[PDB]
């Protein structure tokens with residue numbers, strides 16, 4: 001009968017060198033690892049939205065309580081937690097008139113509807129940021145619910161509200177050349193159609209298409225729905241709130257503030273212990289379903305050092321898909337560039353190449369892409385390749401009572417493959433992390449040679465390092481948690497000329 | 508000397524702030540005393556505390572709350588200081604702390620009311636900031652800041668009460684080992700006998716096409732009524748392999764290798780399962796990757812089995828507990844059972860819309876807990892058990908594969924201690940998790 005080892009719960013650093021398991025406690029006791037002396041908030045939104053922000057912002061200054069503060073740390077309140085003050089009266093407002101939204105929103109197809117609205121926000125944001133003498137740390141996008149409702153793919157605006165009539169079918173628009181007739185007058189209607197067709201190239205989610213559009217100017221932003229900020233107000237006919245945060249209200253405040261904080265530019269925390277020179281490399285693909293070539297897909301790499309701030313590298317769009325196998329793999333030529341892109345960032349970052357590199361994905365690497373790596377890997381560098389999957393085939397049940405096994409147990413199949421319980425029960429929290437019985441993950445070293453048990457520890461640690469969400473741990477290592485989301489942002493915009501950019505530019 | 512700082516904590520109501528405050532002071536370098544920093548088994552309380560304030564404390568702090576006034580224990584605690592006050596003769600020694608807008612002046616005790624307070628309702632950080640200036644004002648005897656003291660109290664005061672124990676235990680799993688295998692594994696040079704087109708998935712005995720041969724547990728004779736022109740086959744043309752020498756990995760060939768054989772058995776096991784399944788009288792549901800098989804309504808006494816419910820009532824729907832399977836060879840031969848929740852409007856009928864099944868499963872799922880799942884998986888296997896010990900999977904007309912209903916238990920080095928009933932609140936907080944599941948909302952839930 002094979003048996004399970006237990007991996008000691010990892011430890012993240014906080015200011016004052018206190019080391020703690022739980023960021024939420026860790027922040028309150030000791031605060032953020034590095035510190036900044038303000039959050040000059042930029043705000044884009046409607047009149048009513050702006051207040052909701054203010055009303056919320058004020059509230060957070062006070063401490064806030066969840067229902068079970070044992071299973072969820074209570075929120076002392078911004079000033080107390082971060083020291084730095086987030087001031088609702090130190091704001092920059094680029095207003096969006098309701099009469100402007102009224103205009104672009106009531107259009108027949110979402111793509112036109114969504115692109116036009118996204119266009120609107122950026123235009124202020126860029127315009128303000130470029131034009132204004134005064135710097136702002138973070139622009140706060142206050143999303144009316146109507147926009148959220150109807151600016152998502154598959155949103156269907158009722159015909160009886162359509163106020164502008166679409167000029168072309170979704171099918172035909174991607175194949176469109178505006179080319180000039182001899183007669184201009186005709187062209188004026190033709191340019192019109194060219195402008196509409198172009199919107200079908202951009203993705204139809206407001207959140208992704210905006211973040212993506214913004215990458216060029218490197219302006220961080222946080223996107224909060226009006227409903228989220230003042231959830232109590234938006235209610236069903238019954239008068240119940242549509243979304244109820246009453247139980248978790250402090251926890252929400254934990255999330256926003258933290259995420260606000262990092263985007264501000266100070267990383268709250270870092271892993272407590274790491275071997276030096278270790279470089280973690282998140283692989284990301286999104287099949288581009290658009291092109292007449294069925295293998296097209298996008299190529300993304302998300303590097304993580306100890307901090308978990310992250311860095312993102314724009315790989316090249318090509319035939320990385322094999323629909324038969326169903327996985328994604330890389331032609332050698334591309335593989336060479338990414339690492340080159342990646343290590344040359346590391347060297348610039350540290351002035352020396354990392355001793356160790358780990359690459360993460362969910363599909364066993366092919367052999368040919370993999371040796372395209374050795375050909376840019378410097379001789380002194382170990383280069384391991386790790387397949388991580390949320391295999392659904394294995395589950396561990398407890399003989400008595402209703403609580404699962406505690407996170408951190410591990411089944412080591414053999415010296416290259418093992419099972420890790422990122423999910424499960426936490427005693428520190430005296431409750432669990434999923435409602436169903438937890439599902440371990442499967443770690444294999446597909447390519448290269450490295451210790452199994454160290455990498456299980458290596459990976460459990462990457463669970464701790466999610467800034468965007470403030471929580472005890474995430475089930476995936478941070479490398480892949482956001483893999484799709486990043487995928488969706490790259491595919492969202494037309495041209496990936498983007499240089500590698502910091503991770504806070506994607507969330 | 509006396510440098511110590513006392514605090515009165517109403518309990519348990521104001522334990523949160525009360526907890527927060529002390530540690531911040533402590534890291535900096537201010538010695539502090541409060542009961543919440545010690546669990547007690549000293550038979551006395553009054554005489555370990557009242558004694559404490561007088562001897563060493565450099566200042567005294569109360570907590571103005573609804574249950575700050577109304578709780579007796581502090582009042583006695585303040586009175587000593589108040590009486591405590593006369594001997595020093597200094598008021599600055601005693602400071603109150605108000606944290607509730609709701610607690611009312613009338614409610615505030617008279618000893619309090621005169622007293623000059625620090626205000627926390629507006630913000631803790633501000634209130635606290637006021638205080639260490641007053642501390643600065645009195646020049647209270649306080650060492651330079653050491654927070655590394657503070658978590659060691661935190662890891663020990665709080666972490667200890669709830670933390671991982673060293674107790675070991677054993678864990679049922681979804682892994683059922685394979686009781687037995689047919690002794691030999693057969694390949695047939697049927698060749699001309701089998702047409703190239705033919706579909707070996709269609710076989711009606713588990714068989715897998717192979718590069719020059721067809722592979723099965725089954726005796727060459729077994730495949731007649733669907734594939735004639737086979738009685739022409741001389742059984743000595745059949746390459747046979749020992750079952751256990753594949754499992755041992757001892758087997759390899761110029762033409763074949765052990766991994767490959769292992770790979771092959773697995774597929775067979777899967778097919779062998781689907782086959783055995785139609786026999787069993789449970790209706791079936793096809794996952795896109797594979798099938799899953801579940802029980803229809805009314806086929807059980809009160810729709811239970813061995814007292815365990817397997818189809819019940821959700822809203823306007825009936826739900827059913829069904830399972831998938833696949834086997835593995837590396838690092839044991841076992842049958843892996845995935846669990847599934849499949850619904851029916853009639854209670855005998857599928858629901859067409861993908862998203863209504865999926866949506867339905869999750870909503871039902873939250874209500875369910877590991878004991879329940881274990882109890883349900885583990886009853887759905889004693890049902891298909893031809894014998895309680897195992898279920899017969901036919902792979903040859905006389906060749907069988909056997910699999911045990913007792914799943915393989917895992918040893919556990921480190922455990923925890925069981926809290927109770929907390930989840931249901933969490934579990935009903937999981938119905939309110941059908942909300943901020945937004946992709947445009949830049950948030951992720953627990």
Ligand SMILES: [Mg+2]
Pocket residue numbers: 108109110111170
């Ligand atoms: Mg459309």
